[PDB]
Amino acid sequence: VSSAAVQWSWDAEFEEVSDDSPEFGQPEIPVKKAQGFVPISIEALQDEA
Amino acid sequence: MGLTKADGGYLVPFQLDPTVIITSNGSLNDIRRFARQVVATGDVWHG
Amino acid sequence: MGLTKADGGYLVPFQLDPTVIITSNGSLNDIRRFARQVVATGDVWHG
Amino acid sequence: NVTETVALLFAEGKDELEAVTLTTGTGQGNQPTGIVTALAGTAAEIAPVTAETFALADVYAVYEQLAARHRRQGAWLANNLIYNKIRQFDTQGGAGLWTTIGNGEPSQLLGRPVGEAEAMDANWNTSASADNFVLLYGNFQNYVIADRIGMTVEFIPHLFGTNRRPNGSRGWFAYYRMGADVVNPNAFRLLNVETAS
Amino acid sequence: TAETFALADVYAVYEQLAARHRRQGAWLANNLIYNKIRQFDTQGGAGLWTTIGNGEPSQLLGRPVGEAEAMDANWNTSASADNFVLLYGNFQNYVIADRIGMTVEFIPHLFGTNRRPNGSRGWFAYYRMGADVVNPNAFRLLNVETAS
Amino acid sequence: IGMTVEFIPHLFGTNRRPNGSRGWFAYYRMGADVVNPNAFRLLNVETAS
């Protein structure tokens, strides 16, 4: 959750105050995948040390 | 500032019920309580 | 059956950080350390 | 945790307003007078030795064109960009070596305390304003800030609609009072880099 | 100045960042850029970072220094028109999501074009991770355009 | 054989290579019939079409 600061102002006597509702935001961070593959042969597996 | 998302609606907790509700009629039957059951070994049972 | 909502994506818990991140630059000032400070007990301060 | 979140938001909002108005306050209507506005157009404002140019000579001139009574109680206040430009004056390691690469901001310039405030002007070329106040030095005891009341946060129990009936909303009020102006606009010296339009 | 790297660029990157983030940040560039920073002083002026005969300095302008050779360092020889060489900012706003580490599985039997064994075996490894920036105003990246 | 669930650690793809999926196989074996058809009496309500 992210937000921003409220904004003030200089007012005189008997002056109506403004609407100063803060604003909100919601960042997202997705999760991804990576992979690898190394095929080998049976004879290669048995001979190579 | 109300229940809308951009006006402070991102702070309400997400409420969820983990349990699973089954939406299938299924079946009820009673042969297996009255009938006779025999254990087979191969593919064909002879009597 | 993957992570899509209609194919079993409704069983994943919702993660959220309640802490709030401020995205405002702000302002830093040091005149309050060097300027002279007095208390006013009325509408104006005379000298 | 709405209440404390909004209280914090009020806190930095008040800080933003107060820090900026202390530096650039118009002094008309409902604003307290700021240090830069009150020292503009008087004898405090000086000009660079070379038009549209900032050099070490100007840094000396702003300090040396002040009465000895107030110079001993002086202080430097400007933006980080101006200090960084001052930091580039030395090239051959002469008598202008303020500090080298790999060290923090120095805490003394010409033996006087140094201050930073990013509400002042930063750069003159990119700016569209004709007047640029970039450096300010003087005895800050002549800038008086009159304070009356601190920040108060007060809770409205009910808000009414057009027909003067409840609608189901509540409020949060906060007010704050302060004023300031320069008693003596002659103990400061301000440098004005006026770019020709 | 276009298509140039001077000492003033370091201050330009450093100073244009907000004071709330400037006071907590670190540098990040490639080795060639740091060596170019080294080769900015000749007569022992303000640009003196460290004399020859010593290792890479541990701090720049009183701020931590990091290294990453995946960044772009040299621009004239490269065919890219965009060159991001120096980066300084508050890195506490860079979030990295870690879910699972490096795991390796061993498949005992592979199959051929007709779903029959082909006398092959293999290893399978995967890894999950995600990252993003949550505040773009906590950084100041330098771009050295070299158009035409 | 009763209900048995087997776990397939790896499923392959178009090019006969792993794709990052697993499998759940379940099967059942049974059979039933009648020995003596004269031991029951069933009622057939036939409606003309």
- E strand intervals along chain E: 26-29, 65-67, 84-89, 94-107, 120-133, 139-143
What's the rounded Cα separation, in Å, for the pair D172 and D109?
Answer: 45
Residue E17 burial (C-beta neighbours within 10 Å; 0-12, 13-18, 19+): buried
What's the rounded Cα separation, in Å, for the pair E43 and D92?
Answer: 5
Instruction: Output the DSSP codes for D72-119.
Output: TT-EEEE-HHHHHHHHTS-SSSSTT----TT----S-BTTB-EEE-TT
Which chain D residues are within 8 Å of B11, Cβ to Cβ? 1-2, 5
A30 touches chain B (CB under 8 A): no
Please name the amino acid found at residue B12.
V
What's the rounded Cα separation, in Å, for the pair D85 and E11?
Answer: 8
Token pair recorded at residue D18: 């107060």
Phi, psi of B5, deg, nearest 5: -60, -55
Task: Please say whether the beta carbons of D7 and D148 come within 8 A.
Answer: no
**Per-residue exposure over E124-148, b if at least 16 CB sit within 10 Å of its own CB, e if not:** bebebeeeeebbeebbbebebeeee
> Could you say which DSSP state residue D166 is in?
B
Which residues lie across from F25 on neighbouring strands? F6
Q: How many other C-beta atoms can be found within 10 angstroms of the C-beta atom of residue D83?
A: 19
A4 touches chain E (CB under 8 A): no
- How far is A23 from chain E, CA to nearest CA, in Å? 15
Which chain B residues are within 8 Å of F32, Cβ to Cβ? 35
Instruction: Output the DSSP codes for B1-47.
Output: --SSGGGTTTSSPP----SPPP--------HHHHS-----SSS----
B6 touches chain A (CB under 8 A): yes
Q: How far is CA E91 from CA E25, E27, E65, E135, in A?
A: 6, 9, 12, 10
What's the rounded Cα separation, in Å, for the pair D150 and D147?
Answer: 8
Q: How many other C-beta atoms can be found within 10 angstroms of the C-beta atom of residue D180?
A: 24
**Per-residue exposure over F2-38, b if at least 16 CB sit within 10 Å of its own CB, e if not:** eeeeeeeebeeeeeeebeeeeeeeeeeeeeeeeeeee
What is the β-pairing status of strands D133-138 and D188-192?
antiparallel
Pick from D66, D84, D77, D68: which is nearest to D23 by CA?
D77
What's the rounded Cα separation, in Å, for the pair D100 and D104?
Answer: 9
Q: Whole-angstrom distance between the N-terminal and C-terminal Cα of chain F?
A: 44
Distance of CA C14 to the CA centre of its chain: 24
What's the rounded Cα separation, in Å, for the pair C24 and A22?
Answer: 12
What's the rounded Cα separation, in Å, for the pair C3 and E17?
Answer: 40
- How far is B13 from chain D, CA to nearest CA, in Å? 12
The sign of the CA dihedral E134, E135, E139, E145 is positive
B16 touches chain C (CB under 8 A): yes
Q: Do the chains contact at A27 and E132, CB–CB below 8 Å? A: yes
Q: Find the helix packing angle between D80-87 and E8-15, rounded to 10°.
A: 160
Tokens 């090239």 -> residue: D91
Q: How far is CA B25 from CA B22, B28, C26, E27, in A?
A: 9, 10, 62, 64
Q: How far is CA E95 from CA A28, E19, E100, E111, E131, in A?
A: 10, 21, 16, 42, 6
Q: Do the chains contact at D91 and E46, CB–CB below 8 Å? A: yes
* Residues making up chain B, counted from first to last: 47
Spell out the long-range contacts of E97-100 with Cβ–Cβ below 8 A and sequence spacing 24 or more. Answer: E97/A29, E97/A31, E97/E129, E97/E130, E97/E131, E98/E129, E99/A31, E99/E128, E99/E129, E99/E130, E100/E126, E100/E127, E100/E128
Chains E and C touch (3+ CB pairs under 8 A): yes
Strand order through the sheet with E120-133: A32-41, E120-133, E94-107
Q: How far is CA D104 from CA D82, D119, E22, E59, in A?
A: 15, 21, 12, 10
Size of interface B-C (CB pairs under 8 A): 7
- How far is B12 from chain F, CA to nearest CA, in Å? 35
Method of determination used here: cryo-EM
Pick from E141, E144, E129: which is nearest to E25 by CA?
E141
Over its C-alpha atoms, chain B yields an Rg (Å, rounded) of 27
SS3 assignment, position E86: strand
> Could you say which DSSP state residue C38 is in?
E
- How far is A33 from chain D, CA to nearest CA, in Å? 36
